[PDB]
Amino acid sequence: SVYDAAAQLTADVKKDLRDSWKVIGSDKKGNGVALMTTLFADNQETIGYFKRLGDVSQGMANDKLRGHSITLMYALQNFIDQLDNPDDLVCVVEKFAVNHITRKISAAEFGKINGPIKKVLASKNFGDKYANAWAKLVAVVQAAL
Amino acid sequence: SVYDAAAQLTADVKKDLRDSWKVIGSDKKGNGVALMTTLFADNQETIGYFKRLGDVSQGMANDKLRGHSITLMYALQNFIDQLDNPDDLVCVVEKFAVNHITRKISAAEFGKINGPIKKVLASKNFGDKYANAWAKLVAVVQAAL
Numbered sequence: 055s056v057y058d059a060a061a062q063l064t065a066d067v068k069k070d071l072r073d074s075w076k077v078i079g080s081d082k083k084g085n086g087v088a089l090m091t092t093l094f095a096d097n098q099e100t101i102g103y104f105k106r107l108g109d110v111s112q113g114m115a116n117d118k119l120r121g122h123s124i125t126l127m128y129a130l131q132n133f134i135d136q137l138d139n140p141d142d143l144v145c146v147v148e149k150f151a152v153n154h155i156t157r158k159i160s161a162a163e164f165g166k167i168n169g170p171i172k173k174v175l176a177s178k179n180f181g182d183k184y185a186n187a188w189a190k191l192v193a194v195v196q197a198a199l
Numbered sequence: 200s201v202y203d204a205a206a207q208l209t210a211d212v213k214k215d216l217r218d219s220w221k222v223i224g225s226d227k228k229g230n231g232v233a234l235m236t237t238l239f240a241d242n243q244e245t246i247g248y249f250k251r252l253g254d255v256s257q258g259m260a261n262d263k264l265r266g267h268s269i270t271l272m273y274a275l276q277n278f279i280d281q282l283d284n285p286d287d288l289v290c291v292v293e294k295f296a297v298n299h300i301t302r303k304i305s306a307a308e309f310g311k312i313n314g315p316i317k318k319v320l321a322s323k324n325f326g327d328k329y330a331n332a333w334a335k336l337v338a339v340v341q342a343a344l
């Protein structure tokens with residue numbers, strides 16, 4: 055269950071998530087847009103899903119993309135803040151899961167975000183250990199998809 | 200005009216928003232649920248819109264309502280963090296406006312949240328001064344609906 059996936063996040067994993075978020079989460083606009091642009095660059099097949107955002111190749115200049123990207127970072131902020139209470143983490147993960155289920159995003163497709171996350175983390179010198187920690191958090195969302 | 204509405208957020212208004220948010224934002228789960236339950240209690244005619252959440256009279260015991268309420272508080276955190284840059288505040292307000300436009304929520308009905316905000320703020324010892332400050336931020340969203 056989602057609860058099982060969440061309840062598994064250990065003290066060490068939570069520490070790595072919080073340490074890396076202190077940095078990447080400090081510039082939500084910059085890193086949020088970087089995450090999205092990287093997703094579109096490496097997984098071009100996902101561009102069609104974001105037609106509401108218009109021309110995503112415009113990057114930071116695209117107001118709809120910027121608004122979406124900043125907001126995405128607050129969804130992550132939400133997850134990070136609920137790490138110590140699995141009950142709260144589960145109900146927020148399920149809420150966001152619905153947002154993607156309605157768009158027909160499968161667990162496998164949601165996992166495509168791991169590549170971009172690994173790259174954005176590396177840009178700030180956070181290695182494989184941190185990318186693995188984030189993959190575990192993404193896995194909690196996948197348990198709900 | 201969302202831009203003209205954003206222009207109404209003067210130095211004094213921004214300070215009151217930040218000062219009150221430091222307190223209310225410290226307990227997103229508790230105050231978020233309080234805001235929602237107050238909305239449903241005082242404006243029963245809005246309950247129909249929240250059909251997805253199930254039995255909202257259950258309050259904190261309703262997992263979907265709790266997840267929704269916590270997430271709502273992060274939307275407000277987002278707005279507060281964008282106060283320095285009107286261009287970024289506007290793009291995040293418009294992103295959320297779309298979420299409500301698709302739910303058939305008008306500017307007038309969105310404005311019904313002002314009652315609950317004033318009531319909960321008052322229970323925290325924050326008077327009309329602060330309620331009015333928040334009404335100005337709410338007015339920015341209303342301009343986009």
Ligand code: HEM
Nearest residue numbers: 100103104106125126129130153157159163164166167298
């Ligand atoms: C770290 C992972 C991710 C986070 C935190 C995230 C966050 C969000 C948020 C907060 C929204 C707005 C929901 C709404 O207002 O309805 C959203 C929308 C969306 N997401 Fe994600 N998402 C993630 C990964 C993905 C991936 C990998 C895909 C696709 C392969 C995806 C596809 C979508 C689509 C299509 C929308 C709708 C965009 C629109 O039309 O406005 N998301 N996401």
Ligand code: HEM
Nearest residue numbers: 153245248249251270271274275298302304308309311312
């Ligand atoms: C302080 C003002 C408010 C904030 C910050 C707020 C925030 C939010 C957020 C973040 C969502 C989730 C969007 C999504 O995932 O699609 C949402 C959903 C929703 N909001 Fe609001 N909202 C506010 C006031 C209102 C008011 C006054 C109404 C109705 C009179 C309203 C009706 C809705 C509805 C119907 C949904 C969909 C719930 C669902 O089915 O999951 N909102 N709101």
Ligand SMILES: ClCCc1ccccc1
Nearest residue numbers: 219220223230234319320
């Ligand atoms: Cl600044 C506080 C806006 C507010 C949100 C939820 C409950 C009470 C007040």
